[PDB]
Write a protein that binds this ligand. Structure first.
Ligand SMILES: O=C1CN2C(=NN1)COc1ccccc12
Length: 252
């Protein structure tokens, strides 16, 4: 039973925004004082919105991975809330930007490694994500990131051209996500028009090597960006390669 008694929740300060409403941090008193994230729903007094909001919680129930945010429970009567595991440090993009000059390379590589483990897990569950980007990643601690919950600049050419979405197109998007982390949260193709992104990629052009990114890690990003989806590594191969790049970086 995922239904939580409202009196067990102390609503704290607003910490961010979601599609349905504000996200707040708070406290969950269970049989004691667990820090939680509380997702609110502005229009949940309407059942069409309520069903869509609560469907997200039902989706979360299916996953059990250390690098995917966990659902704690729901409050189905107005105001409708979803109680999630709190990732205290917030959104990854903002975290990377604020810590641009204070996060070492080993930490950046660790975040890419952890995200590849969560994605190889979702691949093993036969779940295609379709929206892999640094914006949907949350920070639990300085050493732990988690997956939370058209973007032409992040999309595989087959997804843009023919709406083909597979684990291989998720790999392309993850290559862009790895570039974003190594770029300290800078978005890809800044100042480039969406309709001119496909052309540049068709021309063989790719996102450049981020400053201070190891060549072995940049090489792994470019394999994610092979035009042919069958030539892209699988998430399991990404995981094994990122583990070796992480160890090499941890050794100096
Ligand atoms: O499910 C969640 C959603 N979330 C948090 N934790 N857990 C904390 O950082 C956030 C920042 C912005 C939006 C959502 C969150």
């Amino acid at each position: 039973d995922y239904e939580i008694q409202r009196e067990r929740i102390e609503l704290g300060r607003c910490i961010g925004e979601g599609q349905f409403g504000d996200v707040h941090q708070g406290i969950y008193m269970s049989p004691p004082a667990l820090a939680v994230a509380i997702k609110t729903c502005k229009n949940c007094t309407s059942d069409s919105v309520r069903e869509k909001f609560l469907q997200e919680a039902l989706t979360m129930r299916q996953f059990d991975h250390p690098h995917i945010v966990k659902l704690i429970g729901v409050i189905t009567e107005n105001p409708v809330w979803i109680i999630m595991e709190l990732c205290t440090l917030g959104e990854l993009r903002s975290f990377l930007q604020v810590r641009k000059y204070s996060l070492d390379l080993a930490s950046l590589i660790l975040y890419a490694y952890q995200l590849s483990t969560a994605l190889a897990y979702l691949e093993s569950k036969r779940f295609v994500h379709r929206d892999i980007a640094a914006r949907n990643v949350l920070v639990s601690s300085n050493d732990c990131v988690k997956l939370g919950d058209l973007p032409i600049k992040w999309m595989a050419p087959e997804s843009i051209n023919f709406r083909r979405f597979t684990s291989a197109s998720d790999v392309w998007m993850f290559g862009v996500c790895m570039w974003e982390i190594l770029m300290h949260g800078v978005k890809p193709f800044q100042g480039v028009k969406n309709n001119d992104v496909i052309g540049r990629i068709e021309n063989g052009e790719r996102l450049p090597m981020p400053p201070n990114c190891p060549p072995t890690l940049y090489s792994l990003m470019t394999k994610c960006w092979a035009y042919d989806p069958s030539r892209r590594p699988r998430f399991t191969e990404l995981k094994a390669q990122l583990s070796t790049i992480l160890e090499e970086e941890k050794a100096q």
